[PDB]
């Protein structure tokens, strides 16, 4: 058991799903420019589209792994429960996915790159917001967890 850069296997289905999502995106933009749907509905439709796309490429990764390379290290570690989960593997092989603004709002454009392909400085910068927000969330969470724990201990101790 080892890990090479090729052990993260980009499915052939990826490009297909991406192109489909692209033409769908174009259709939505066209539907917007003709004044059929508002900015809100357009944004929501784009987000939903990219979410479903993400699910599709994930399933593509795991199906390709199951059928073609059943002993693939990432696949084995994920399946056995030794390490990793479908989403992280998806980030390694399929797309990184949608990222959110500091305001919680999600960017219309997703990160099409994987960690095996490597990201672009703009994509990396976009992801950094989420990462930072996560770290801050954790740090701020531990304290409240401890305080609550102590409250419970004090009320239940006798």
């Amino acid at each position: 058991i080892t890990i090479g850069i090729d052990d993260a296997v980009i499915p052939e289905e990826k490009k297909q799903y991406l192109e489909e999502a692209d033409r769908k995106l174009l259709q939505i933009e066209q539907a917007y420019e003709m004044g059929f749907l508002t900015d809100r509905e357009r944004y929501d439709q784009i987000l939903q589209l990219w979410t479903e796309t993400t699910e599709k490429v994930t399933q593509a990764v795991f199906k390709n792994f199951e059928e073609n390379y059943p002993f693939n290290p990432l696949y084995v570690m994920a399946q056995s429960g030794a390490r990793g989960n479908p989403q992280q593997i998806r980030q390694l092989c399929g797309l990184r996915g949608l990222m959110q603004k500091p305001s919680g709002e999600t960017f219309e454009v997703p990160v099409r790159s994987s960690f095996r392909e490597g990201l672009t400085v703009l994509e990396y910068f976009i992801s950094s917001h989420g990462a930072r927000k996560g770290g801050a969330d954790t740090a701020l969470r531990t304290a409240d967890s401890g305080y609550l724990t102590r409250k419970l201990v004090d009320v239940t101790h006798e």
Partner: protein, 39 residues
């Protein structure tokens, strides 16, 4: 922990408090830890 009837003298309250508390740092479409404290 022993999968058998609890021994008399076991401190229940502390085990309860700890059992609820320990996963707390893991709590994250979800209300989460603030909801827990709210309750």
């Amino acid at each position: 922990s022993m999968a058998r009837p609890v021994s008399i003298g076991e401190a229940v309250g502390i085990v309860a408090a700890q059992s609820i508390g320990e996963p707390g740092t893991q709590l994250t479409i979800t209300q989460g830890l603030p909801r827990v404290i709210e309750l």
